[PDB]
Structure formats: C-alpha cells, structure tokens
Amino acid sequence: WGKEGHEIICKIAQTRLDETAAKAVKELLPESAEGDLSSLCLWADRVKFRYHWSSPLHYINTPDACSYQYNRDCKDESGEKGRCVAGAIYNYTTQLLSYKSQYNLTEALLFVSHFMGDIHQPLHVSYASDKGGNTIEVHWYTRKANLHHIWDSNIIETAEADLYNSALEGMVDALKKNITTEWADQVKRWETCTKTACPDIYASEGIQAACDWAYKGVTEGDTLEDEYFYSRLPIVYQRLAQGGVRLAATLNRIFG
Ligand SMILES: *[C@@H]1O[C@H](CO)[C@@H](O[C@@H]2O[C@H](CO)[C@@H](O[C@@H]3O[C@H](CO[C@H]4O[C@H](CO)[C@@H](O)[C@H](O)[C@@H]4O)[C@@H](O)[C@H](O[C@H]4O[C@H](CO)[C@@H](O)[C@H](O)[C@@H]4O)[C@@H]3O)[C@H](O)[C@H]2NC(C)=O)[C@H](O)[C@H]1NC(C)=O
Ligand SMILES: *[C@@H]1O[C@H](CO)[C@@H](O[C@@H]2O[C@H](CO)[C@@H](O)[C@H](O)[C@H]2NC(C)=O)[C@H](O)[C@H]1NC(C)=O
Ligand SMILES: *[C@@H]1O[C@H](CO)[C@@H](O[C@@H]2O[C@H](CO)[C@@H](O)[C@H](O)[C@H]2NC(C)=O)[C@H](O)[C@H]1NC(C)=O
Ligand SMILES: [Zn+2]
Ligand SMILES: [Zn+2]
Ligand SMILES: [Zn+2]
C-alpha cells in the first residue's frame, strides 16, 4: 500500500496491542516516532535501494492463475527461496522472538509492520505477467493510473475525500467500529494462527481477491469510476482491517 493504507493498518494494530507488546513496541521505536508505530510504517518503502536485498520482500509473484503456494511462489528473481513478503514476515517475526544478537530489532519491527500491511494488498500477491497490475494502464476517473497504484492508493484516497471529509481518522474509526460490532466473529478467525505468523493464509486470500475483485472486469484502457470504486471499496476495507488485526495479533504473540 501507499502511505494511507499503511497508516490505517498500523494505527489499528497499535490500539489492539496487549500491555507487553505495547511496551516492547515503544522500546523498539525511535524517540523521533514518539511512540506512534504509524509514523514509521512506510519506512520499508524508503530502503528498497539502500538495502537492495529488501525489494523482493514487498510482494509475491504468481503465474497467471488464482493460487498461491509457498514453495512455488516464494522466491526472488534469483530464485532464492523465501525471498518474498511471506518469507519476510517469517524472518522478521522470528527475529523479534529474541527481544528481551546480530539483528536490529527496530528494523525487524518496522519490516514486519510494513510487510504485514503489504501481504494484505491483493495486488502485492498477484500475476508476475503484469507485475502485480503495474503494467495495466487504466484511468482513475480523469487521471491515468495503473491498476496496482489504484489499489495501493487511489481507492483509499478517494474514499478519504468523498466519504470521510478528508479525515483519515474518520475511516480508521469506521474500520475500528466494524471490527468490534459487524466483524467480531471474522476478527477472531483473522487473529488465529497455530505457528507465530500465518502469512500463507493471508497470501492465499490476497490472490483470490486480486482475481475476484482487482483484475475482474478490467481491460487495459478502461476508465474506472464510481461503479468500480463502490464495488471494490468493501474488499479494500476488509484487507485493511485484516492487516490491522493480524499485525496486532502477531506482535502480541511474539512479545507474549
Ligand atoms: C532476514 O532479515 C535479515 C535482516 O534484515 C536480512 O539480512 C540481510 O540479507 C541480505 C542479503 O539477502 C544481506 O545483504 C548481503 O550482504 C553481503 C555482505 O554483508 C556484509 O555486511 C553486512 C552489513 O554491512 C553484515 O551483515 C556482514 O558484515 C556481511 O558480511 C553482500 O555481499 C551481499 O551483496 C552481494 O550479493 C548480493 C546478493 O545478495 C548481490 O546483489 C550484490 O551485487 C553483491 O554481490 C548482500 O548485500 C544483508 O547484509 C543481511 N543483513 C543482516 C544484518 O543479516 C535477510 O535478507 C532477511 N531475509 C528475508 C526477509 O527473507
Ligand atoms: C537500527 O536501525 C535503525 C533504522 O535503520 C537505525 O536508526 C537510524 O539510524 C540512522 C543512522 O544513524 C539514522 O540516520 C536514521 O535517522 C535512523 N532511523 C530511525 C528510523 O531511527 C538504528 O540506528 C539502528 N541501530 C543500530 C545500528 O544499532
Ligand atoms: C461498516 O459496516 C457497515 C455495515 O455492514 C457498512 O455499511 C454498509 O455498506 C454499504 C456500502 O457498501 C452502505 O450503502 C450501506 O448503507 C451500509 N449499511 C449500513 C447499515 O450502514 C460500512 O461501509 C462499513 N464501513 C467500513 C469502513 O468498513
Ligand atoms: Zn505498501
Ligand atoms: Zn504496491
Ligand atoms: Zn511496500
């Protein structure tokens, strides 16, 4: 996701942390953050070339099909296994199990926070043939955009201005509201994991949603407007709340 999506995810996550996780996160966050996880949840997007080895870790590429398998899909352009957003979540959550060696646990926190968000972007788990939709040029109303960008940013941004009078906390408060009184049963399931993180579950969901909702109906050159916006906004919200809930659930498990 772009900036809004990651904020929303990390804000939600942070208000769902139990006391020990809440403590850990403050201790790992720099003073410049001022205790706010969401201030640094885009940090990973700023180090793709600083740490060139990190850039495959933001997504998963699948063949032209609506499935994800770890052993098949989790790998970078060198074919190196586990070099994908799923493998990264396993790596960085494992490191945070060490919190009380070789690893910067402030980075692991910032990577895990970001990647938990990214694994929930449907187009961060989608076709390598169109690079997760980046090569599908459409218009977002009057502006040229690619399909990937529409899911990273445009949909959230449009809802932000059109249904929440330019206040993001408007939308955060509404996702939070639906977490406790519409989605309560779903949320319990979203939080369940029998490992420390359950990334392949989230990836499988994402590829399903890329196909059912993101790619669906869309042809190169289309103008996506109200109809697409309104029918796809519910899955965007779904995926933000899920990221939010699973990020918190994961840090609670790790630090507990
Ligand atoms: C799990 O999380 C960790 C922590 O973030 C990640 O660890 C990094 O992994 C990358 C590679 O995937 C490492 O980058 C490589 O570093 C090599 C030398 O590193 C030295 O320097 C570092 C810090 O300066 C020290 O750890 C130590 O002194 C090392 O000796 C370079 O030689 C590599 O570059 C060469 O190979 C690459 C291919 O990887 C080529 O592209 C280049 O052209 C070049 O020839 C490379 O840069 C990085 O240093 C690791 N850091 C640490 C702290 O361990 C894991 O990647 C991550 N895994 C996941 C998410 O799956
Ligand atoms: C652990 O990693 C973090 C982030 O990479 C380091 O914090 C950064 O330090 C650099 C270099 O001095 C600064 O320029 C940045 O402003 C800092 N960023 C953040 C987000 O805090 C931290 O110093 C590292 N810990 C080490 C090396 O022990
Ligand atoms: C929170 O959940 C509510 C209710 O399930 C969603 O509101 C419904 O959604 C449609 C748009 O898809 C509206 O036209 C209906 O009028 C709504 N019903 C009610 C009772 O309000 C709402 O959009 C969800 N909000 C978020 C942020 O997820
Ligand atoms: Zn993102
Ligand atoms: Zn993206
Ligand atoms: Zn990213």
Author numbering: 1 to 100, 107 to 201, 203 to 263
Please quote the authors directly.
AtBFN2 (also called ENDO2) is a 34.5 kDa glycoprotein (the predicted mass for protein component alone is 30.5 kDa), encoded by the Arabidopsis thaliana At1g68290 gene. AtBFN2 follows the standard glycosylation pattern of plant S1/P1 endonucleases, with three glycosylation sites (Asn91, Asn110, and Asn184). While the P1 nuclease has a higher specificity for RNA over ssDNA, in a previous study we showed that the opposite is true for AtBFN2. Structurally, Zn2+-dependent endonucleases present a unique fold, and are classified into the P1/S1 nuclease family (pfam ID PF02265), itself part of the Phospholipase C (PLC)/P1 nuclease superfamily (pfam ID CL0368).
We obtained a ligand-free AtBFN2 structure, as well as a phosphate co-crystal structure in a new unit cell with space group P1. In addition to our improved AtBFN2•SO4 co-crystal structure, we were also able to obtain a new, ligand-free, structure, which was solved from crystals belonging to space-group P 1. In this structure, we found that four water molecules coordinate the tri-metallic cluster. Finally, water four (Wat4) coordinates Zn1. Wat1 is in the predicted required position for an activated nucleophile, further strengthening our earlier proposal for a reaction mechanism.
